[PDB]
Every structure is written in structure tokens, then in C-alpha cells.
Structure 1
């Protein structure tokens, strides 16, 4: 099975250098061109360049020439994309793909590497209870001012899944994120069932368990 596996998501500050990777397996790595593509959040595909690992033949798109370095390490079947000085505008998803099969096309893709570049510093969230029509009540918690993503929210340590709606975060002008999770429950269950939102924020080594009760 042919396969291209890219390196994990990166969160960086502007000015830092970064080298991300694309590892080939199940084929002769030196015998196929590797393409790099950029996709900024919510935008289209942009060709960055291409490289033939066999002889390091490398071509860049005009808009990327001199902005980034494409290279390869033959001995470990890995192609690379690197920056010497990250800009916030380098925030994007990066894909690699193999040009293969008698005319070739992009037949295998890496899973993508997300690069987030921001001046924001790591910060754990402040969690606030959102206290509770028909026999149905809505309650939740507000996960305020954290960086970076992701935060994971569960209810009653994963015991409550039905009626749970966790909304995608907003990015504020401060560079910090905020999200909300709300759960819909039978109103008859209020005061007979405990409701606690478990908010884990790995990057800040912070986990909060917020009990939510009627005002």
C-alpha cells in the first residue's frame, strides 16, 4: 500500500523557523515527483512547488519562490517544506501529493499538516456556567479566552452525550478563542441529575469541571 504521511499540527509564533515533513512508504521514493499545496482557512488550493527526490530537481511557483524551501532526504524517503521566518499569513493547511500512475496524476495525498502562526501566547480558559420551553431545559458552559485550539468539552465525564451541542470557537481580536457547549435536557431531570461540563485544555495543562445549576 502506497502512503504519504505528513507530520503533526504545528502552532508557532511569527519569526520562528519551521520544517514540516512528508514521509513516503510502500514505493520507490526517489522515482516520483512530490507536489506541495497550500490552503489557507476557507480559501482555494495554491501550488507551492514540486520536487523529484531522485536528483533534487525542484521547481517553485513564482509567488512562493524565495519564500520557502522544498527539499528531500533520500535515505529516509521524506520530503520537506521549510520556513526560516514564519509570518502570521503562513497560517494554512499544507498538503503533499505524489505524482504517479501512462500519464501521471496526483494519486496519493498526505493527510495534511495544519500550521497556525500567531503572536498569542498559551492561555488556559475561564469556564463559566450557563444556567437554565416545554418539558425541555437548556444549560451549558462558556469556555472563555483560551489559546491555542483545541479545547475538548464533555459532559458528566462522557456519560452524557445525547442533546449535547458544542459550538465551534470564535477567534477574538485579542487572538484568544472562546466557545460554548450547551446541552438540552428534560426539565424534570433538573435537580435530580447533576450536570458538570468537563473542559480540557491540553496546551496549558488545565482541566476544569464546572458544575451547572439553576440560578
Structure 2
């Protein structure tokens, strides 16, 4: 009924990728097949395989010899192992259910993003974007981080209307993105504007106060 993927978000090439799906609300031995599906950066979907409620497995021949799907019935969990990964295994990995008498992928987890890369986890530098000029739009430039993603919160999230988050791009091996916020000319710089930049992979949060001149 409810599925939740977990596991490392960054794996180096040539190593094994291991993920866990924790299932609640339904026993993985009672019915259904329990599947792994992945979505590549270009958004194509690939079914990888399943473990059935009786423990039998079936795998996509595209992954022949490289995949194992196993389970722990005591914890209502099932697992993916993908061996000898390369950067082409970078994808969002989903677990999902199948019922033989229907045939579709009915219930899905939220997905977990895995990056296969030799690049090192690096927290972002946060730089202010303020008008030189000599409504007002401000921003924060979030540069030099790896892997994805980051979240930018303006004034601890209070500031809701008029925030834009631009998707990150790679620049010399590291991600860069920016976020914009637009506020009434009456509130800045009279009231403080701060961006708060969270990078879960490095367990860091950094705040930058926007200053005028």
C-alpha cells in the first residue's frame, strides 16, 4: 500500500548500487510482485525486475548478470543490488507493486535519486544577487556543489509569493543554480531578506543576507 525507497544517493563507478524499499500497510508475502523501475535523466523509464510474493524473481534481460532482488520478510522490506555500476546507471529508482490478475504498476514509492559518479560530495558556495542599479528582485547564486539537489528558502519560507528556483546545470564538474525572489520595494532593504540554502548530501545549511548599495 505504501512504499518508500532508501539508500545512498551517490555511488562510484565500478561499485555496487544497493537500495531498500520499506513497505507498510500490506505484507510482501501476502500478494503482488514487488518491482524496481528506474527513470533516467532524459526521463525514459525502464522496468528492472521483481520479487514475487513467494520469493521468486524475474529480471529484465538488459540487466543480465548484474541485478539481484532480495527481501527480508521479517522487516517487510525488499532490496535492489545492481553490480558494477557506470554513470549510465544514474537514475531515479522507484519501487512499485504489480497484481497478476490486473497487470499494472498500481502503487509506487516516491523514488530515490542515485548519481553514479567519481566526483566528491561538495557543499555549495552561496553568493548574493543584489541590484547594482547605480518591486525589487533579489537572488542567491548557489555554486560549486555536488551531487544534486539543494533547496533555497527565502526568509525561512515565510516569503512565499514570487520565488523562482532555476534548475541546476553542471559547470566544470560541479552544479550551479540560482533562486530569485521578488518583494515590494517598500520591504527591501527596509526589512532583511535572507536566503537559506540546504544541501542534504553534505548535511549543510548556509544563510546569506542580501545587502544593498
> What's the TM-score bracket when you normalise by the shorter of the two chains?
0.7 to 0.9
CA contact (8 A) 1:53 1:72 kept: no
| Structure 2 unaligned regions, length at least 5 | none
How far is the alpha carbon of 1:208 from its aligned partner?
A: 2.7
Report what 1:74 is aligned to: 73
How many residue pairs are counted as aligned between the two chains? 209
Show the 5 A alignment for 1:166-181: 166-172=165-171, 174-181=172-179
Bigger Rg, structure 1 or 2: 1
2:64 equivalent in structure 1: 65
Which residue does the alignment assign to 1:198?
196
Are the aligned partners of 1:8 and 1:114 in contact in 2 as well (CA < 8 Å)? Answer: no
Could you tell me whether the CA contact under 8 Å between 2:162 and 2:183 is conserved in 1?
yes
In structure 2, the residue matched to 1:210 is: 208
When normalised by structure 1's length, the TM-score is 0.83
Partner of 2:184: 186
Q: CA deviation at 1:8?
A: 4.9
The answer to whether the 8 Å contact 2:123/2:199 transfers is: yes
Q: Is residue 2:45 matched to residue 1:45?
A: yes
- 1:36 corresponding residue in structure 2: 36
Task: Indicate how the Cα distance of structure 1 residues 160 and 62 shifts in structure 2: closer, same or farther if over 3 A, else same.
Answer: same
Q: Secondary structure at the match of 2:4?
A: strand
Relative to structure 1, is the Cα distance of residues 81 and 206 closer, same or farther in structure 2, using a 3 angstrom cutoff?
closer
- Cα distance between partner residues in 1 of 2:39 and 2:164: 28
Contact 2:39 2:92 in 1 (8 A): yes
